[PDB]
Amino acid sequence: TDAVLELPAATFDLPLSLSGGTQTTLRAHAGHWLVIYFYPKDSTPGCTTEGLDFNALLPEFDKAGAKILGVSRDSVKSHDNFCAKQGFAFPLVSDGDEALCRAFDVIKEKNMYGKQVLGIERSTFLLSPEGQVVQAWRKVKVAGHADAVLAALKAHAK
Numbered sequence: 001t002d003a004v005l006e007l008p009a010a011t012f013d014l015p016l017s018l019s020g021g022t023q024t025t026l027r028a029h030a031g032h033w034l035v036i037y038f039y040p041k042d043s044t045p046g047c048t049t050e051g052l053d054f055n056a057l058l059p060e061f062d063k064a065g066a067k068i069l070g071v072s073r074d075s076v077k078s079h080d081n082f083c084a085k086q087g088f089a090f091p092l093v094s095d096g097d098e099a100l101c102r103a104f105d106v107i108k109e110k111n112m113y114g115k116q117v118l119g120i121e122r123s124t125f126l127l128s129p130e131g132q133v134v135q136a137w138r139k140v141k142v143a144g145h146a147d148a149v150l151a152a153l154k155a156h157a158k
């Protein structure tokens with residue numbers, strides 16, 4: 001009833017490779033809120049701005065018991081380098097095979113260059129403590145975004 005997106009059951013058990021060398025799963029986050037933000041490419045201007053914006057709000061997400069995950073299809077090593085350079089204190093998922101991206105339907109097509117071109121569309125989601133996707137943002141405008149996500153989280157967590 002309150003879900004805005006339905007994920008295949010298997011999505012929650014996908015092994016998600018993280019920066020730092022461990023794996024997580026969405027089911028492993030049961031019991032707390034999870035923010036999942038998808039971005040197209042490590043170490044580019046918009047993606048760096050977005051990551052820094054979430055990083056600055058980490059104590060506010062903590063106040064709510066929430067965790068954050070950033071997601072792109074860059075490698076674990078790329079993610080480690082991005083986290084170290086920028087000082088990120090949350091993990092990045094290396095979704096190299098785009099399994100998580102496809103589950104959230106963030107791989108979008110554009111007719112460009114006389115081709116059908118597929119790529120990650122910047123998108124964010126709020127996953128409840130019981131694993132429901134209760135809010136989505138697609139074609140994300142980076143400016144103001146992390147603040148808006150935090151506000152929405154607070155409103156939902158009540």
Ligand code: NA
Nearest residue numbers: 043081082085
């Ligand atoms: Na970087």
Ligand code: NA
Nearest residue numbers: 029032034128
């Ligand atoms: Na969760």
